[PDB]
């Protein structure tokens, strides 16, 4: 079908305001020598590492 009338500014904005995203949350690297933000359950971009402070492992050589 085809829109019967021009949608009003109120209704258009009511619907359009719900097209939105959320901010990425980010977590601090557990590595003391990096301390950079990364995604949770994701290897750190800055050091390529993963794991808790005690038992770290390297996932990316970057």
């Amino acid at each position: 079908a085809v829109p019967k009338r021009k949608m009003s500014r109120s209704n258009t904005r009511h619907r359009r305001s719900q097209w939105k995203t959320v901010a990425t949350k980010l977590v601090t690297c557990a590595n003391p020598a990096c301390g950079e933000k990364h995604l949770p359950h994701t290897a750190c971009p800055s050091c390529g590492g993963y794991g808790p402070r005690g038992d770290r492992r390297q996932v990316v050589e970057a």
Binding site: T42, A43, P45, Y50, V60
Partner: protein, 120 residues
């Protein structure tokens, strides 16, 4: 192993069969592979079954592994290097780690690697 329930990789079940075989072969050839999250999590069981078969070295076992893989250099690596590495490991020969996303299509990437350290 278990089927994949939903729509298959590559637009056809035959192509997913081929993709998983190739991905497991590449993981065995290189030791680690960056292969998007779903492909890594989907090839983990098949690769682990192949490594478990490769743990015991016989000609029948090598032929059965060569049904999959189909590359004899990969079979040699699997029965000579990877297989002996997991003598005391009862399962869990691989691990998957999320790596980020791809810029082009937002695909969540991951690294699947074969466990590199001896259990003992």
């Amino acid at each position: 192993p278990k089927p994949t329930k939903g729509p298959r990789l590559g637009g056809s079940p035959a192509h997913e069969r081929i993709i998983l075989r190739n991905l497991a072969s590449q993981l065995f050839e290189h030791g680690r592979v960056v292969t998007t999250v779903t492909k890594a999590k989907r090839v983990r069981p098949l690769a682990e079954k192949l490594i478990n078969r490769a743990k015991t070295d016989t000609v029948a076992n090598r032929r059965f592994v060569n049904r999959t893989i189909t590359d004899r250099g990969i079979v040699h690596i699997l029965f000579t290097e990877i297989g002996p590495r997991m003598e005391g490991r009862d399962g869990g020969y691989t691990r998957v780690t999320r790596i980020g996303i791809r810029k082009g299509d937002n695909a969540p990437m991951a690294v699947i690697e074969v466990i590199s350290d001896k259990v003992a």
